[PDB]
Amino acid sequence: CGYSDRVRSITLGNSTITTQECANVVVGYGEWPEYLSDNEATAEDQPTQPDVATCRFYTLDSVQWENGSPGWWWKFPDALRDMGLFGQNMYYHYLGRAGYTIHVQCNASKFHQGCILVVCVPEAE
């Protein structure tokens, strides 16, 4: 082979993120997101699915990591409410359903040290 497992390319919509240092990719609870079935439907009206227009990488704001800083949190889907046509569909529709690819980016040279936990907590009251 010529492959390495440190390089990865995720293309979704018209947006591609590349990364040349990573360690695998965690699929939450072993299950890959997919559309609602007709055995689990409750709503009777025909769903809209905007596909490519609403699936794509939205870069949210970036905070600076400092020596004293204690940590940060964001709440989803609430955070995405101003992001393009996702925001619009969410604004004009009573019900919504979607999964998400969370990709946290950071980098430093060899003469830095430090370690951050990146965790997705469902239902954090």
Binding site: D38, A41, A43, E44, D45
Partner: protein
């Protein structure tokens, strides 16, 4: 069958919704004349594009039996421990 045979049952479920598409037909399924004394049989698929849904709901607490068959208080009557000279030593209810 017999309503005194309680181990014999039946099963039915609530109707499903079949998917429909847009039309530009010459048939009106939501126009009717109330005067007739006929209740319209419109279903959501007649005026919207609906998806296919399967219902497994079952009407089962709206059966006449299940509705009426719970023990209700109809009356309470009072009586003391007495002698024959008392007229409250027994009591009766029509």
């Amino acid at each position: 069958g017999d309503v005194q045979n309680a181990v014999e049952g039946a099963m039915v479920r609530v109707a499903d919704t079949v998917q429909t598409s847009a039309t530009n037909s010459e048939r009106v399924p939501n126009l009717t004349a109330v005067e007739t004394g006929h209740t319209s049989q419109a279903v959501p698929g007649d005026t919207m594009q609906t998806r296919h849904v399967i219902n497994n709901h079952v009407r089962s607490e709206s059966t006449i039996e299940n509705f009426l068959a719970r023990s209700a208080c109809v009356f309470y009557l009072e009586y003391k421990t007495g002698t024959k000279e008392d007229s409250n030593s027994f009591n009766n209810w029509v």
